[PDB]
Amino acid sequence: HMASMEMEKEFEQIDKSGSWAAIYQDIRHEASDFPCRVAKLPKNKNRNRYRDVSPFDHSRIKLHQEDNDYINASLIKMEEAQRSYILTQGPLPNTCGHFWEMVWEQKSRGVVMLNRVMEKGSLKCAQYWPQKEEKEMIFEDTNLKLTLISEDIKSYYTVRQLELENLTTQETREILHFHYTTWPDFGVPESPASFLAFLFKVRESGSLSPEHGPVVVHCSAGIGRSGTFCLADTCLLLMDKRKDPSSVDIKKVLLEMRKFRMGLIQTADQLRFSYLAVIEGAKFI
Ligand SMILES: O=C(O)C(=O)Nc1sc2c(c1C(=O)O)CCNC2
Numbered sequence: 542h543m544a545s546m547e548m549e550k551e552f553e554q555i556d557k558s559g560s561w562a563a564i565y566q567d568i569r570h571e572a573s574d575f576p577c578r579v580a581k582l583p584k585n586k587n588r589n590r591y592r593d594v595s596p597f598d599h600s601r602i603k604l605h606q607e608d609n610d611y612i613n614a615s616l617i618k619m620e621e622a623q624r625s626y627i628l629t630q631g632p633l634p635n636t637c638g639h640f641w642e643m644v645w646e647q648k649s650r651g652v653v654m655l656n657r658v659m660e661k662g663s664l665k666c667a668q669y670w671p672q673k674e675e676k677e678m679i680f681e682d683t684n685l686k687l688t689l690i691s692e693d694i695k696s697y698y699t700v701r702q703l704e705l706e707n708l709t710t711q712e713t714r715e716i717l718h719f720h721y722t723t724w725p726d727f728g729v730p731e732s733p734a735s736f737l738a739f740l741f742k743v744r745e746s747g748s749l750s751p752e753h754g755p756v757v758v759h760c761s762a763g764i765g766r767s768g769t770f771c772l773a774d775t776c777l778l779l780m781d782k783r784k785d786p787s788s789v790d791i792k793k794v795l796l797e798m799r800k801f802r803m804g805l806i807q808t809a810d811q812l813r814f815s816y817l818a819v820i821e822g823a824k825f826i
Pocket residue numbers: 591593594656665726727760761762763764765766767807
């Protein structure tokens with residue numbers, strides 16, 4: 542609760558001085574810079590959505606195949622918070638099989654999608670999941686079948702139940718798809734409240750629990766909206782875990798996160814929203 546007070550005070554000071562842009566640029570300046578050799582290999586060029594968004598070598602997810610283990614995905618491991626997330630780009634038409642291979646191999650229970658397939662007339666992500674029950678998808682390169690089991694469309698987000706089957710073994714797994722449909726690219730959710738309800742729904746599902754593989758989180762690039770979501774979740778969690786006397790430094794936590802994947806949170810206003818969500822979330826809880 543001491544942490545709640547200090548964070549509100551910090552928020553108000555930043556807000557009054559109009560320092561969000563400067564503080565965000567400071568974070569960009571001091572963010573970790575690690576090699577992305579595998580990502581930059583010529584043969585992986587068509588596996589990357591954006592030339593300026595790559596996974597670091599040290600934290601990238603490796604596909605368990607022998608010919609090419611590369612996917613644009615990173616493991617964010619928050620030690621104190623005991624949270625792990627896989628942040629990845631919105632799959633390309635040729636990497637949908639890879640995406641679901643990763644989900645299978647990493648034993649993820651949930652996938653958090655923070656974008657729409659089409660945004661402002663532009664394709665931002667492949668249609669990597671089935672839209673009708675009787676029309677399943679088969680990914681021949683990775684030998685997986687994907688079936689839409691059910692779908693619940695709400696005003697701010699959609700929750701789906703998917704069934705992923707390893708065709709090689711005929712083993713099946715239930716995957717939860719949490720699709721936030723009202724979060725504009727390079728923007729913020731319509732309110733802290735609707736963001737928090739979404740986050741709480743993801744939390745309640747067990748998808749973030751140590752008993753499962755890490756949740757898969759993605760937007761178009763897997764850094765802007767994806768970064769905002771994970772930062773808020775982790776910081777909210779730390780607000781609860783840490784006893785007085787304590788504080789939660791959102792800037793430090795974000796820098797910690799950026800050790801695992803570049804460019805997490807893409808605008809100063811997304812950073813500001815992160816503060817708001819954590820502050821409001823903590824008050825509610
Ligand atoms: O989807 C997000 O929230 C996100 O970070 N998107 C990003 S990050 C990023 C781009 C995009 C994009 O969507 O066009 C394009 C240029 N490079 C950086």
